[PDB]
C-alpha cells in the first residue's frame, strides 16, 4: 500500500506515502512519509563530466 509519490531516479530520492491504519478511530491514522534517498559517495558534481570534482554537498 506504499503509493509511489515520486520515483525520482536522477537524485535517487523515492518518496512514498501511506495511511497507517493504526487505531480504530479513523482520525489518528498517521499520514506517513517515506523519503528514501541514496547518496552517491563517489559521484562527481557533474556526472557527465568524469573529471569534475567530488560532490560533497548534497542538497
Amino acid at each position: 500500500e506504499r503509493i509511489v509519490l515520486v520515483d525520482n531516479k536522477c537524485k535517487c530520492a523515492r518518496i512514498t506515502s501511506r495511511i497507517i491504519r493504526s487505531s480504530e478511530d479513523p482520525n489518528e491514522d498517521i499520514v506517513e512519509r517515506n523519503i528514501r534517498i541514496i547518496v552517491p559517495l563517489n559521484n562527481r558534481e557533474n556526472i557527465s563530466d568524469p573529471t569534475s570534482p567530488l560532490r560533497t554537498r548534497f542538497v
Binding site: 498517521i30 499520514v31 517515506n34 523519503i35 552517491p40
Partner: peptide, 23 residues
C-alpha cells in the same frame, strides 16, 4: 487526499552508499 496531505510521521532514510552510482 489524505495520503498526500500534511504528514504526521516523516521517516527518512538517507542511505549513504559508496557504490550507488546509478539509481
Amino acid at each position: 487526499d489524505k495520503s498526500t496531505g500534511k504528514p504526521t510521521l516523516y521517516n527518512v532514510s538517507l542511505v549513504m552508499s559508496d557504490t550507488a552510482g546509478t539509481c
